[PDB]
Amino acid sequence: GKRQTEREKKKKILAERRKALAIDHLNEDQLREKAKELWQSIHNLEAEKFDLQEKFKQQKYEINVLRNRINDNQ
Amino acid sequence: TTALVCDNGSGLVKAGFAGDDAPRAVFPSIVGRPRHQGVMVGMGQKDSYVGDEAQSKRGILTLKYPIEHGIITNWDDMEKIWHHTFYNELRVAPEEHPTLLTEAPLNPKANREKMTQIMFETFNVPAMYVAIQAVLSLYASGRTTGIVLDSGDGVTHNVPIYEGYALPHAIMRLDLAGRDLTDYLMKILTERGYSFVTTAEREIVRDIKEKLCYVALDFENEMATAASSSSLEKSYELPDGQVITIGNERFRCPETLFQPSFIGMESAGIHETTYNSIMKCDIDIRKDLYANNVLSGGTTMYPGIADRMQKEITALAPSTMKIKIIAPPERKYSVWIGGSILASLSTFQQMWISKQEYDEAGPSIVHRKCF
Amino acid sequence: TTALVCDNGSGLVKAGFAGDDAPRAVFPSIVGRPRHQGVMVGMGQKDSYVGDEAQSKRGILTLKYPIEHGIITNWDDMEKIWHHTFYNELRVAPEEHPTLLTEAPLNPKANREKMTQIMFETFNVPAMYVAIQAVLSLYASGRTTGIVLDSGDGVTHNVPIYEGYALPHAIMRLDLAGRDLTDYLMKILTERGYSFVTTAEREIVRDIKEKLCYVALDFENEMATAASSSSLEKSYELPDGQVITIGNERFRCPETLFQPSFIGMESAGIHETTYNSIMKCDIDIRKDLYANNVLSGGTTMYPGIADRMQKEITALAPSTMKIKIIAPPERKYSVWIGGSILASLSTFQQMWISKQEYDEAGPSIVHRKCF
Amino acid sequence: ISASRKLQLKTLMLQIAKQEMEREAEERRGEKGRVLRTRCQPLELDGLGFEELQDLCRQLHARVDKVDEERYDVEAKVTKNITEIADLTQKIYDLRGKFKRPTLRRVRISADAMMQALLGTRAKES
Amino acid sequence: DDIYKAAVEQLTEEQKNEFKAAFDIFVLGAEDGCISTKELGKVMRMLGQNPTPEELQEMIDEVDEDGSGTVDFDEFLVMMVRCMKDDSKGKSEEELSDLFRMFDKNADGYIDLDELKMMLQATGETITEDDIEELMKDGDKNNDGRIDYDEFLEFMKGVE
Ligand SMILES: Nc1ncnc2c1ncn2[C@@H]1O[C@H](COP(=O)(O)OP(=O)(O)O)[C@@H](O)[C@H]1O
Numbered sequence A: 001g002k003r004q005t006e007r008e009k010k011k012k013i014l015a016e017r018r019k020a021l022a023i024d025h026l027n028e029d030q031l032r033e034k035a036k037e038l039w040q041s042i043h044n045l046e047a048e049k050f051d052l053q054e055k056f057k058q059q060k061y062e063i064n065v066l067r068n069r070i071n072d073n074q
Numbered sequence B, C: 001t002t003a004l005v006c007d008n009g010s011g012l013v014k015a016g017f018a019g020d021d022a023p024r025a026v027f028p029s030i031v032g033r034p035r036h037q038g039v040m041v042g043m044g045q046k047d048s049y050v051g052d053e054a055q056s057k058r059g060i061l062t063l064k065y066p067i068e069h070g071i072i073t074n075w076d077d078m079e080k081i082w083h084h085t086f087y088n089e090l091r092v093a094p095e096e097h098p099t100l101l102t103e104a105p106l107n108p109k110a111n112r113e114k115m116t117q118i119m120f121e122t123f124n125v126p127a128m129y130v131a132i133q134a135v136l137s138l139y140a141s142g143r144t145t146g147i148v149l150d151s152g153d154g155v156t157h158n159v160p161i162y163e164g165y166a167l168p169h170a171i172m173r174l175d176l177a178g179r180d181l182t183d184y185l186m187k188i189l190t191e192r193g194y195s196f197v198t199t200a201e202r203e204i205v206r207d208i209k210e211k212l213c214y215v216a217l218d219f220e221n222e223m224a225t226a227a228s229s230s231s232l233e234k235s236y237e238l239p240d241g242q243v244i245t246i247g248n249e250r251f252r253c254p255e256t257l258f259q260p261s262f263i264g265m266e267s268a269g270i271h272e273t274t275y276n277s278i279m280k281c282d283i284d285i286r287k288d289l290y291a292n293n294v295l296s297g298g299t300t301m302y303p304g305i306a307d308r309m310q311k312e313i314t315a316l317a318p319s320t321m322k323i324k325i326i327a328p329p330e331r332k333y334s335v336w337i338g339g340s341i342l343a344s345l346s347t348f349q350q351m352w353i354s355k356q357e358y359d360e361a362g363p364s365i366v367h368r369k370c371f
Numbered sequence D: 001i002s003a004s005r006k007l008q009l010k011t012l013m014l015q016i017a018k019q020e021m022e023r024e025a026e027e028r029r030g031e032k033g034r035v036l037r038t039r040c041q042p043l044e045l046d047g048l049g050f051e052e053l054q055d056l057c058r059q060l061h062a063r064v065d066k067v068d069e070e071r072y073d074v075e076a077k078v079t080k081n082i083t084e085i086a087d088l089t090q091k092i093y094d095l096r097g098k099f100k101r102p103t104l105r106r107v108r109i110s111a112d113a114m115m116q117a118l119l120g121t122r123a124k125e126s
Numbered sequence E: 001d002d003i004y005k006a007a008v009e010q011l012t013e014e015q016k017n018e019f020k021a022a023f024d025i026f027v028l029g030a031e032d033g034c035i036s037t038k039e040l041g042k043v044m045r046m047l048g049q050n051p052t053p054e055e056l057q058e059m060i061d062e063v064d065e066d067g068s069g070t071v072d073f074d075e076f077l078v079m080m081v082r083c084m085k086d087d088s089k090g091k092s093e094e095e096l097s098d099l100f101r102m103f104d105k106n107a108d109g110y111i112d113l114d115e116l117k118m119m120l121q122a123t124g125e126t127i128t129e130d131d132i133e134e135l136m137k138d139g140d141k142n143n144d145g146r147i148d149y150d151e152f153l154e155f156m157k158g159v160e
């Protein structure tokens, strides 16, 4: 199933992004490092999502341009 | 908000917002990949032309319908057709509109469940409902009783209804429809010399069938007349010239409806499956069904069918009952008009399959109370 | 950098940088060794004069074309011609310029593979691409459909194209072209007393054909008129005096195109191979091909051919279709203009056969995806 | 108006639009950085019992999961949107492209060479 | 178009006298007193360039407005500086497309001419409202009162 394939692939990516958060055995400094890793990952995802938002705004405006030209080309 | 009354059909997809008189966009449901190589660079050649675009470039495509007989045989192509219908022919995102699909009676369950799963996962509609294609055609006539013969292009089915109570044991579904008539016409045209083989030329034969064929009131007399005089031979101009002349192929193509032995089918014609569907009903509602016989669907648009069918049923039925055949001029879109009326009702507003309900019971919700 | 759009042809080599309107250097493709002994010492006599230099010393040379019918029969001479074209007529070393050769349809593979091997090993170009001579002529017209009849000097081929998708099963390649017309004219001139035999005098007969011959609108009427009056006899001055008078040889030489039985060829004329090429196409794109018939190549420059061909096709074709023959004034260089346009495209910039690709797969790379 | 002032206006508008677009892009980047720094909150819990440390580990693991789910969904949506945009661009071109074939001229060689070929011996200053 | 007019209006009377004397010397012995399309084409053939008569007619129609087929003093200088095309490639398509898309600050697919007014205020060249009016007339091909994206391409087509 192509839709099944999409759902399965997205869930696979979801699973992959789930790193092994098995770390209590670490000491204080290592766990602080891991927390910073998570924090930096979150901030980078924030940057990625902001880029997605601005690119979506651009895509919507360009689709408006496209529809304008379509109407012009009656 | 407003509801989207889509109607997949088989041969023409008809869609439009609920509450209007006619579907907004009507276009053939064909998806055709190009088949030749292609030498011009940068021409912007796509990989699949769907809908009405592939009826203009059909010279270099291989059109293939994604719906064979009511059932859907190629789910990817059907998804493509739906995506086109939503985004380019109506230009309304499905995230903000309920949908009302239509389905033939006695179809496989898996088809309906996959349809609802697609509508809820890919297009992500708020709520969708699936309705039987004959009840809508009964809505459009403004009746509440009557036995409706909905001879589409994929499958011909005959659902009797009384006082709003459908009779599930009297549905007679027959798989002869417009497509088989097109194939039979394409097969009998070879008796004069015209050979149509390519899947693109099936469209030309369909146009010939639509514009020229008619149903004879009496078959033997017409066969005798066409074999002596020449008052029937009507000519038609192909898409390139070389006019053709159709003789007694005119009324022999749609005669297959009343004698399915022509294409080798065993069953009885549409004139006798209606009488059989009536006789399975109870003895006290047969008069009302006799008086309110309804025609619908595209294939019942042949000039002169509402008289041939009435003559046949009057021959079969008891002499006292009155036989009346309702044939509205808006036959082709009758199902969609009925769908619009049903979606516009206030009493119906709580029958939709809401998305949270689907999340709790899975796609098998459609067979449950929300039918 | 800029691309070199070379176009080998057969009879005239046309070359120039991509992005211009006309080829930079156009010169006959003949290589002629001297044939007499030579007594002056130190005159600086070379062993082979190529290109336009051998059209001025042709009195003591034996000119021989290195390309017979599209195919290349003498690879050393062709290499010499290419070397001259690159170094003396354009003065650009090939180490810094992509090349875009052109090739007739349905040619032997070995010819194309040897061509690419030469271009990559001897001249050592960065990347070369081989294109069919008819698609370019379709580029130059600014169309995207149409059936192009490219009657060169070596071979006449007729490639139909629709919406950018070439139809490989409808290419009709015929080997009658300008050279056979030159030979036939040289053969019918003997009926008045003028005998041209030497390979140098073939050039004089070619000049006569170019300057005097024309295609008759109706052949029998012209044959009758030229046999009674004397309004057609046009005179021409040889390279030494002794003017000659051409009578009904004027329209009999190019008539061979429409009746190849004159030179003993069996096949049908260029007026009927186009109709046959159309009829092999699908039934739905025949109107567009009828309306967009394109002429190209040198030999289609005869005065009055765009009317004779239209009359013939209108006679053959169905009466309803409109027959239109596109005959741009820049017919001779149409293929090269199209080549320049194609080489100037941004979308095409990644289709070149890069040298590292050739090093990995050998000369047989040309038949692969990089066509 | 005189074409010189027209070209001057054209290049002035080019510069104005370019500088304004660049300034607006830089401002958008600054706002993006500011707001993203506002959205993600730095933490400081070093030296604490590993129970709370791992509680933060799990909380931020789940948080990473949520942000990844959201961002990847949005990214897939935006990729689909850009694909559709390209489709519509191709549609518009195939509707009304064709004639968009450019022309390049090289026969007009540099005017010095043309003047030389014209003059010859008297090609001393021109 | 008027590009050569702009280029020579940047230039001064030095070019005027230069091309006048060049006409005096090279076109010496002529009977027309100007340069004709066929005249310049034959001159190109004499020097070694190979222009076509159709190109000759096209270029003379481009340079000649009154239909005379010759060159006025300003037209003569425009044609003389025309034969060589030093400046090409006309800015960049994508960057200017982005500039125009952000020009529609309202992002409605339409250009408010007040935005044009403010941008011109930024430009500040000695210009009257009728000058920008004429510029828009040059640009607003469909006369919709705004700047269409395709018309934005057209009026900036090849503009350095
Ligand atoms: N005017 C007409 N005359 C005869 N046959 C028609 C006419 N219009 C449509 N048909 C036949 O009906 C078919 C369309 O039926 P339709 O009702 O659209 O099917 P569906 O139920 O799938 O929508 C066509 O394939 C054609 O063969």
Ligand SMILES: Nc1ncnc2c1ncn2[C@@H]1O[C@H](COP(=O)(O)OP(=O)(O)O)[C@@H](O)[C@H]1O
Residues within 6 Å of the ligand: C008, C009, C010, C011, C012, C013, C151, C152, C153, C154, C178, C179, C182, C206, C209, C210, C211, C297, C298, C299, C301, C302, C332
């Ligand atoms: N003006 C003309 N009139 C008639 N025939 C011509 C004319 N010009 C060229 N030809 C013929 O066309 C040939 C040149 O064709 P060309 O298009 O150069 O071939 P290729 O496709 O090999 O380049 C010459 O051999 C000549 O016979």
Ligand SMILES: [Ca+2]
Residues within 6 Å of the ligand: E063, E064, E065, E066, E067, E068, E069, E070, E071, E072, E075
């Ligand atoms: Ca003038």
Ligand SMILES: [Ca+2]
Residues within 6 Å of the ligand: E103, E104, E105, E106, E107, E108, E110, E111, E112, E115
């Ligand atoms: Ca704006």
Ligand SMILES: [Mg+2]
Residues within 6 Å of the ligand: B009, B010, B133, B150, B152, B153, B297, B298, B335
């Ligand atoms: Mg139906």
Ligand SMILES: [Mg+2]
Residues within 6 Å of the ligand: C009, C010, C133, C150, C152, C153, C297, C298, C335
């Ligand atoms: Mg050629």
